[PDB]
Symmetry: D2
Subunit: 310 residues, 4 copies
């Protein structure tokens, strides 16, 4: 009834509470708060048109603060207003929102992609490029003698997998994560080219910018990212079914193919959730589970990485 890695319900928090740990900074109740205040703060650095203290000095303590300092206010939304206003101990009192809220989502997605998914995919690709250039010459399949279909080398056929994985690498990554902006207030600022303060802003967050107009943050480049991870994830399950399978056959002489079964296990689950979330039409419940389907691929990766080493 407590709540730890032992008594957790989902494995991403439980069995694999850690090393999947990195998602805690991004998709937990904390994560998305940590992300939303940053941005809505990095903008108030707006005041420079006239430092980064709390965007960095922020933890579960001020996420708990914003949590306790909600559930009292008579407006439901804009609880974040009073917190940032609390840590004001000046005439900074401008709390515009909304497009900023998208930038949040973009940034968390952006960070997931660049600082976890990709670094994982790269370990996985590399370990496949080794296990191939090591199994060069090791023949496969066909049908002994008296039948062919197709004869190759387990190594060359593992090279293709690394190559397929390489394409979904490039495919992730070229998924465009966009953003843009555009009160009776901001006319305290008569000296700025607001398109520009905006382009400068968005960009400063490492988001790609702006127009064609500014209206549609269709806001499902999530679909695009997730159909891609799941494309990669499927490539990996294919890889999983090769090792476990080859070591099914190398059990005709005299290693535990566990890990390749697990990796398969979790990948089917990533994909399940990932796809689900990707085809669902503020998406706060979709938003609150962006990290789950991702949490599942990390397990699969740490598990494939684990097999191999063997």
């Amino acid at each position: 009834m407590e709540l730890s890695s032992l008594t957790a319900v989902s494995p991403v928090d439980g069995r694999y509470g850690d090393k999947v740990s990195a998602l805690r900074g991004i998709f937990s109740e904390y994560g998305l708060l940590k992300f939303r205040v940053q941005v809505e703060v990095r903008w108030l650095q707006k005041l420079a048109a006239h430092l980064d203290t709390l965007v960095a000095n922020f933890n579960e303590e001020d996420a708990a603060r914003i949590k306790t300092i909600e559930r009292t206010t008579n407006h439901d939304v804009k609880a974040v207003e009073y917190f940032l206003k609390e840590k004001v101990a000046f005439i900074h009192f401008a709390c515009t929102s909304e497009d900023i809220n998208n930038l949040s989502h973009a940034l968390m997605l952006k960070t997931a992609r660049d600082e976890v998914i990709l670094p994982y995919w790269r370990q996985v690709i590399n370990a496949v490029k080794d296990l191939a250039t090591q199994y060069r010459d090791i023949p496969l399949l066909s049908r002994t003698h008296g039948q062919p279909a197709t004869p190759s080398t387990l190594g060359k056929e593992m090279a293709n997998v690394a190559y397929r994985m390489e394409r979904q690498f490039r495919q992730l990554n070229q998924v465009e994560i966009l953003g843009k902006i555009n009160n009776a207030h901001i006319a305290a600022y008569p000296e700025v080219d607001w398109h520009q303060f905006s382009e400068e802003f968005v960009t400063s967050l490492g988001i790609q910018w702006n127009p064609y107009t500014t209206q549609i943050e269709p806001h499902d480049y999530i679909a695009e990212l997730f159909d891609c991870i799941a494309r990669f994830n499927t490539i990996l399950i294919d890889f999983d079914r090769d090792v476990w399978g080859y070591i099914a056959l190398n059990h005709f002489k005299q290693v535990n193919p566990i890990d390749f079964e697990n990796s398969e296990g979790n990948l089917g689950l990533s994909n399940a959730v990932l796809h689900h979330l990707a085809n669902k039409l503020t998406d706060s419940t979709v938003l609150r589970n962006l990290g789950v389907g991702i949490g599942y691929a990390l397990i699969a990766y740490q598990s494939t990485l684990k097999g191999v080493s063997k």
Copy 2:
């Protein structure tokens, strides 16, 4: 980076760490251990063919014990052997396994169904039977004047939902959760009708028994249970889309339909995972996530129950 309801990755452990709390006793790393030792212990009460101390006095402390007292032994499986053997401080030393391992899975599923899913479904049905017999006379749809299609009362059309929910109640519940049994050891027991010690045993666990032979614990009555929850879950999303929808229209005069959107949200996710797990062909990774898809329906229920009250 810590690990609590704030920094959890999945919402079942995080935002809804609690009241979904009850799954912690069943599907966590703890749960399934708690379940596997019970059974493999309630059998050793076998020795009665000649009390329930630790099956009851068991917690995260001895799940941590079995966890630390694994990862050292040179056999990987049967870590559970040494623990039960440790708490032996007599000639009880018979540690048969396997069919017992199925009984574990049956029992946890059994307990989930009888002590959480059903008590939840019943709250949900009741609250639908109220909101109907309260909205009697409230008309709906058709098309004002100049068009019909079909005209009823929001209340009678909510009665059907309660009735549909009633059928999936009966349908869950009549899903049969089976079990059976059948060393050079047990010939210390020359005085028992083993079929009978077995039928008595299985049954004593409240599992339904035995033969036609004993060979196939096909072991996916999980499919059967899960296609049923997800049938119910879909009925509820239908209900969700009625309230949110009616209160879309009752916003033509002068309540937050949040909760009915959430309930919808999580139910689509239960179903996603639930179905996934149900169509996957020892299933330890499937096993380790039996509680997730279920964890998601509980949120949906607590959320529908929450709307209504309004």
Copy 3:
């Protein structure tokens, strides 16, 4: 550009136009018409409260008739009214509808289940019971010498599959397909106990009856049937992966495992569509594709039946 088995788009009409042929009588544009007029005619046999000519003498010719004799009328629905009224060449002129429309759907589903799905499942079960009692003694897996996991006989492990298939047989079949009834017209009939003419009617169609009230033909016992076929279908894919797999290994000496791959192929597609349709919330588009997901299992069956014979 023509339209035959060669130039068809979907395989159920194309490659397997035939032997899957039997669905043409049920789920085609024809089928559901054939079904809706029957019922809405077998009722007019109502006039007996005072023979079966066209319910039997009905073909593509009068389905074409009802098709041409639609697309002209200025009401869209009730095109079926004018056709039955045409073949009136007396004072039978009472054309009540609606609950009758459900009975149609029930009956087509009913007929699919009793006259095609089940007769197929039974062939499939039998052929598994042979291939098992023929492979008795043939050992399997484990890991030669120096490793076990679990050692059995390919035959006993095929018996379980037949047994699992047997349970989903019984499970289909006990899915309840319900129906019920209940103008200023029918008061030409002052001499009938209408509840009774109704119970007699429904029942006469071999539908199970009536009340608890009469309001909710929840009308997704389709879900229930389809989660069941797909449960069975998955059992079969499991079987498929055993033969293709065993004959992967029996290719260590000196038959084409095609058919077991195909059967797998189509079953994944049945299930895809079947599940889809089952979780979708008049369902005319769902209605118009009830036979597709089913069309796909038949291929899988004819294909598994085909392998085996080998």
Copy 4:
């Protein structure tokens, strides 16, 4: 029991046998034959390193020919050899295969994308750009007076949909469909730079080429294409739920939202099948149903295009 649009089982062949007609040239048993002989013939134009008669003069008649002239030969595969060899009535007798077989699949996919999916998407985008610039000024939602959430114009919010659709247009289309090549025979040709005859060849088919090596036609750019159509398809269902929905509200005064329900209907089915096929790991059964999930989007499009006009 015959086989036409009336008695077809699937709607793509049946109710919508036509205008979906165009897929008959591509994904039917005919299609893929028509495609495989072309290519394996356009190559024999190889002999130019020393016209297009039958690649153009090919119909159901020679697909029937290749069908009858199979089922007799004692090799199962290479039935296509004897047919092309039949229509030899010179020393052209070189029948290399395999990489050519991929080029076939690429080309059919290529043609589907450029000559049907895209021309459809473009009609759909345009009709959305009209229905928006026509509904400019028409306000929406919020909550009359006493509640907001967010207030816009049905027209501007339809512009975003056209814009979202535009991105998946560009996204399809930039999906790379690749190909490459590389007997004791071709040493009748000592005068050609074979890499080049190959690059020239592939390219001549409008396939993108070649190396990085030539080994992995991973051969699921199908995944990539299909996650994209289904991304678009989902955008459209979103659009569907806007019109049907707005005309739910415009039924508060005094048109049939059918078509927008249908389009929704079929799109969920495309996506179901499309996704299915996309996540399945020679794929002849996957291959034989490439046109189904696509057949379903066309209906959805012809249906959305149909609503609108209203």
